[PDB]
Design a protein around this ligand. Structure first.
Ligand SMILES: *C/C=C(\C)c1ccc(-c2ccc(N3CCC3)cc2)s1
Length: 133
C-alpha cells in the first residue's frame, strides 16, 4: 500500500545518533535527542503530504507534493539549505535532499499496520519502526 496516513508512534529506533552525527548536530542536542520516543503524523491526500515529526524535544514539520521539487531550509534540524524531491519507487516513498551532504534523505514504507523509515546521511542509516495508533 501507498497509503501512509495516520498517527504513528515509535516502537523501534536504530542508529539515530549516527545519523545525527553525520548531520553535525551538536553533542548536547544529540545526547538528549537519542533518548526520546518519537511520533510521526502523516496527512496524505493524493500527492499532497503534510508530515510532522515530534518528541518532547522537537517539532519538525514539512509539506510537499510528490513529484514536485522544492527548496528547503532544514530549520531546527541542521539549519541547511537543500533541494528536496519526494517520489515513489513502487510503494516506497523516497526523499532525496540535494545539498552539502551526500546520500541525504529518507525512505518510508508500510508493512501491515506498521510504518518503516530509513533516515540517511553520508554513510549512516537510521532505521525506525512506528505502529499505527
Ligand atoms: C519523514 C521523517 C522525517 C521528515 C523526520 C524524522 C525525524 C526528524 C527529525 C527532525 C528534527 C530532529 N532534531 C531537532 C534536534 C534533533 C530530529 C529528527 S524528521
Amino acid at each position: 500500500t501507498r497509503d501512509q496516513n495516520g498517527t504513528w508512534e515509535m516502537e523501534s529506533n536504530e542508529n539515530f545518533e549516527g545519523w545525527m552525527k553525520a548531520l553535525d548536530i551538536d553533542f548536547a542536542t544529540r545526547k538528549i535527542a537519542v533518548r526520546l520516543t518519537q511520533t510521526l503524523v502523516i496527512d496524505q491526500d493524493g500527492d499532497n503530504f503534510k508530515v510532522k515529526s515530534t518528541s518532547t524535544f522537537w517539532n519538525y514539520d514539512v509539506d510537499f507534493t510528490v513529484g514536485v521539487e522544492f527548496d528547503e531550509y532544514t530549520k531546527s534540524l541542521d539549519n541547511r539549505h537543500v533541494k528536496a524531491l519526494v517520489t515513489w519507487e513502487g510503494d516506497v516513498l523516497v526523499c532525496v535532499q540535494k545539498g552539502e551532504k551526500e546520500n541525504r534523505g529518507w525512505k518510508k514504507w508500510i508493512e501491515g499496520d506498521k510504518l518503516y523509515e530509513e533516515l540517511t546521511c553520508g554513510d549512516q542509516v537510521c532505521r525506525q519502526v512506528f505502529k499505527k495508533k
